[PDB]
Amino acid sequence: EVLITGLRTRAVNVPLAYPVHTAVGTVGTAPLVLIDLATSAGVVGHSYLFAYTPVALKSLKQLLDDMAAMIVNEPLAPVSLEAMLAKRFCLAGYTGLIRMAAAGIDMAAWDALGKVHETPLVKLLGANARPVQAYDSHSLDGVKLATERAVTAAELGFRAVKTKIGYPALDQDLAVVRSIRQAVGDDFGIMVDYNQSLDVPAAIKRSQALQQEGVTWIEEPTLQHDYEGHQRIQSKLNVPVQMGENWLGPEEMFKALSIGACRLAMPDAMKIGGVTGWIRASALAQQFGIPMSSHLFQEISAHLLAATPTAHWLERLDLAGSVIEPTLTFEGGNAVIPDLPGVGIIWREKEIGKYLV
Amino acid sequence: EVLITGLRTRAVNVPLAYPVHTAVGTVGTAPLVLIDLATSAGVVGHSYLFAYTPVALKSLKQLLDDMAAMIVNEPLAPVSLEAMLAKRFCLAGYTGLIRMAAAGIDMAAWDALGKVHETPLVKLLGANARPVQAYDSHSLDGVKLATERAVTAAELGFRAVKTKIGYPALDQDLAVVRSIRQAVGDDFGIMVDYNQSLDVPAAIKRSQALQQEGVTWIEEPTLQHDYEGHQRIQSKLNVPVQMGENWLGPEEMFKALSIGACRLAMPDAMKIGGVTGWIRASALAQQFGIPMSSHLFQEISAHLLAATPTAHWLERLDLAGSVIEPTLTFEGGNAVIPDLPGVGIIWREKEIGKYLV
Amino acid sequence: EVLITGLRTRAVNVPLAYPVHTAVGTVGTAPLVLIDLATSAGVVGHSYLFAYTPVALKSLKQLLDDMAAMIVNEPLAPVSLEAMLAKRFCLAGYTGLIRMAAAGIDMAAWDALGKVHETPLVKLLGANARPVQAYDSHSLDGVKLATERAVTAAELGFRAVKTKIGYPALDQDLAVVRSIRQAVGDDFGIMVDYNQSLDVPAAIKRSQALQQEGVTWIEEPTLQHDYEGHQRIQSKLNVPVQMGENWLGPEEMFKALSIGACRLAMPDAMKIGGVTGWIRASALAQQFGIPMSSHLFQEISAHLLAATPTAHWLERLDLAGSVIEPTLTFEGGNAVIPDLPGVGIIWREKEIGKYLV
Amino acid sequence: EVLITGLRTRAVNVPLAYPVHTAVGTVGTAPLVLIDLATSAGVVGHSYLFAYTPVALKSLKQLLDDMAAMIVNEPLAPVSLEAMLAKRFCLAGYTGLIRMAAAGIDMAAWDALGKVHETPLVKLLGANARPVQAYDSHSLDGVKLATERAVTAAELGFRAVKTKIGYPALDQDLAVVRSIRQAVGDDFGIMVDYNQSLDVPAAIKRSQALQQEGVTWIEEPTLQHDYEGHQRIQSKLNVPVQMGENWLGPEEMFKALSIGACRLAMPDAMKIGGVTGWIRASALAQQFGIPMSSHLFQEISAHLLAATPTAHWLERLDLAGSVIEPTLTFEGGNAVIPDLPGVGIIWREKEIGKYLV
Ligand SMILES: [Mg+2]
Ligand SMILES: [Mg+2]
Ligand SMILES: [Mg+2]
Numbered sequence A, B, C, D: 001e002v003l004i005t006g007l008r009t010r011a012v013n014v015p016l017a018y019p020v021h022t023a024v025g026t027v028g029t030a031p032l033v034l035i036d037l038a039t040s041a042g043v044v045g046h047s048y049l050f051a052y053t054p055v056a057l058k059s060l061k062q063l064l065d066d067m068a069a070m071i072v073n074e075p076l077a078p079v080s081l082e083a084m085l086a087k088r089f090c091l092a093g094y095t096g097l098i099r100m101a102a103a104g105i106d107m108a109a110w111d112a113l114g115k116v117h118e119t120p121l122v123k124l125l126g127a128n129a130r131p132v133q134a135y136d137s138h139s140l141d142g143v144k145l146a147t148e149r150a151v152t153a154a155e156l157g158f159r160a161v162k163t164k165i166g167y168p169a170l171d172q173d174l175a176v177v178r179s180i181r182q183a184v185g186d187d188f189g190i191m192v193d194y195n196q197s198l199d200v201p202a203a204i205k206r207s208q209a210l211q212q213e214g215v216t217w218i219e220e221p222t223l224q225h226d227y228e229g230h231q232r233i234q235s236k237l238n239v240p241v242q243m244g245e246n247w248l249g250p251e252e253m254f255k256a257l258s259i260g261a262c263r264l265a266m267p268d269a270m271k272i273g274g275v276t277g278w279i280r281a282s283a284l285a286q287q288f289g290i291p292m293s294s295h296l297f298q299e300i301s302a303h304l305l306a307a308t309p310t311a312h313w314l315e316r317l318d319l320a321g322s323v324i325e326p327t328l329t330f331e332g333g334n335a336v337i338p339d340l341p342g343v344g345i346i347w348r349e350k351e352i353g354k355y356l357v
């Protein structure tokens, strides 16, 4: 009875507030697919996807455009829609770019369901809005820029930052972390993320040195699919190993928590399967006793974390700020959900045409 | 912003459509606590609890009456309310009659949230209504009455029945099952339930004989908290061991699925923690690959199963038919959810006064 | 041949010798149900239950009043009575408030059996009385009050105290523990209890800091039903993790010891199932090599520990001192069992009427 | 020193020799992306990809077109190229359609390396060509068409066929298998494939009935990512459970063999990561003692199996016969590798234009 009536997608390369420094060089834009899901109720659901690299951007938009005929005239009902897409893609493989596209439809379908009921998503999920602690996420920035970014975050009221590390020598990782720590003081979180760059023995050596410095967690020290190698690294540490941004569906989270790969989790709202996948992931993190943070997608993640019994941190990294209104607020380093139906995503229509592919 | 404004409870002893025959004798009424949850939106949430024995009935109503002050003036938001009650009862022990009372408040709070949004609960949970296969549940009835009840179920269009067994000799269990099977034919489900009555070696001997007869599952062969003993019984069977009506919260389901106690699950909407607990239980049964049925509470369970990715059967056993309107329908042995906001529970006010304690 | 002839219960809110400070505020009374079990031998068994919160108090008394008809005219024989109650409540769920009520009947039935034989309970159980080391249990008291309470305990001759911790920052827990340690010196036990307040990674970080301070054990760092999360915390510690006050029956202790959740145990005489349940729990702690202390119920626990092969500490926390005579004595910080038949509980009849609900 | 100089892709919808019958209806074409990899040596590598559904076809071609700039001017060296692509896609997720595209480049790069050295791929891999037993793979065809297809396969000299089953009742699966068995006789292989359609208990019941009939293996009885559920099904069977066509990379095969999910494996040359991935998969199947068959891609699989120490069957299912010359031969039901450099794939250029998208 409310039916989906259309899917529209727009591929954009948007400027990043913080250019991303990598081992190769700097990237100053993010490739996104913005999604509009029309309904027979006259409301339009909005979401977006991150394509990671511009090599995948046109392919992800073309995949979504060719999935429109599977969803148009189906009832909006995201949990039912997700089961239908999981079955339709069971041969192709309901993972990678297909699962990401399905998650973008789910996150749009939940934003429209909240609009049909004139209620923020957090309340539709049965919870009250609450401010959630956030950390500001930076990149592989070198000692001077990482310290300047940490000092700007601290001046903006965040009480933790994340820096990416994995320089050619462990001394340079430690020089970054120590310089930040001098600038922000001891009563401040410094998360660190090796973005899959170490083998297991290097990750044990480097992480035991970083745990002596005092860091908040150590994120993806090794290849993201190697859950046993993450469990061997965590078995040598007191500081917690954090992972999860690369789990494609809750069935990958379940496999990593069943072997004890990590003592923290941080699903990505797109890769875990949207709101439907995150609800499932929340139930698993509750039973396995794992505090659960978010990865990217801050606008929907502030709602999802408020319904997550083990919620821990929200990652602030504003990928779509150039094309979405700043309805999400940070107040004393906590994200505060807007009082708007659905997710609170409202497009900057005059900006989007600047960045179309 | 919609707040709870009052809790009213009424303890009743209601006549059962099918008197329950036990090893002791017959019971012809069920002790229930009917719950009304007032809200500032003018809608009233309804649920009920089963007290099992009249020894617990006044105590469960008095417990709910003394919990009213913990919930009145809280926002209706069931997931938040459940976290608050779990913390408030963490010393007393958030299990047994305290958890049942919390679940009755959760099931009422979700029925009111569906009424605030003028939408059946199944759609509020994000799914479409679908008819769900049901079986008719009988008792420890002896060969003649069990066969008459199976023939009446088959004439009503059900395609499976459950009988309780655990007579003093295995031959009498087999005489029951064979007589039903003669009366209903081979293309018909016969579930059997030993209601915790066997030790592990007796359960292996009796269940291997019942598996040779051809039964659909073997339910709670031994003490319900002995998950390892259920896993030892299931390791000796091809037919699946079914359990779960006695799990108090999803954290007990998680412990039994982590050791492989059963190849089917059937949570009870009250003991698993209401709609909030069942949503969590559904995510666990999906990841552990366990088809999930319901136990009692048919009216809400038809909605919950339609949102459950591994839904298997709905148990028809109409405990509250004497005091609730028959809005749930069975059509060719499938339960069909009513098109009514929330759960579809509407009290028979002129009947309730007949059965008050 | 000695039969039970009546059950009388009285619900009271009694003043605490040490008001209990919590994260919310102070509580100055304890809700108890005092139990009298009449017999055909003319002796009357006495016990009491702790309801934890006044929300449960009337419900627990009403449950016991409605169980009287299950026990009156049964033989006093507590082990047989316990098997009968376990079977009668196998559907309702023999846990939470039902199991607590059964344990209060068992503890009264053993006090009457000791009176029928004119012998202290410890001798009826086959052991000699012995003084058992006790620690004085305090609350979440802040640095000044926790230090004053530790100095009063040390002046009363106790050689250890327990303080509740789990302040918003780990530095405040450490400020409490260090201030106590300055006041009482190094040759003195300081147990610490987080009363389920931490997730697993916070519990590992905080407990490794507390183990560097030197504490005697770390009690219930995380949710009490999460035995695997307690085992992950204990795997990161040399100091022992203590738990068990929330195990409802020896079957829950068995599940936590089978996974290595803790290196100390401390059953509560009511939640473990009274004297019958504690005897079983003692045999499990002996085989799993776990030193076994008590939680609350000091009067019966001094007898039970003297029969427990792995007895470790008695927790002094005098909940019912306002309504029971001080027949239990502490002599140089050890509890000393009175030479009185049964448990030695004798009501202060002129005080009880002051505190009735 | 031989460098890649260009990538050209063509998306086609090609007619199938055997239309594929499914639970929904018949599909008479396959969506393929044909790949040409130009080199500085003047030879052109050829491969193709299967997109499974036409929903993915344009997206897979656009992804490959946008990956051309990552590979042009790199040395042809497929193992090095694969490591480079795994690192470049480590954030996006080197799985699903990205991994399939990488595998199509690897299979083209090995066909060109064999052409640069004027040697069939099997000899470049260090092995001699040998004929490999093949079975003819059919679909969900109903009793009459499945029996006609089995009789045509047997007349073509194949000594085994595979049929897809998972009809609404187990009796219809058994009616299919029995009808084939009557037509082909007892000295003939009948593999059966449930294409992920059963939950675990249904798969145990149906597969124990099929094992009594006598079938050669039971393939993907349940969801393909549920390796533990495949291990629970295999633990109840003597006949071997076969899986692997949906493993994306050898790292997914390793996870399923480490838990004992299956006693046979059948990687797909595209999803396992091309020739580079299959070489790795072969080493794992050898150490875990698992006979290894192929899935689709018959032309390259006849070469790969001849280098695989545990080679078992080649699956004949001729997806690209309409656009590639029939250089692969079946002689008495064995595939025989052509004596042509590289894989032996030579395009039918006059046919390809008929089927372009
Ligand atoms: Mg990261
Ligand atoms: Mg049952
Ligand atoms: Mg404690």
Ligand SMILES: [Mg+2]
Pocket (backbone or CB within 6 Å): D193, D195, D219, D220, D245
């Ligand atoms: Mg297959």
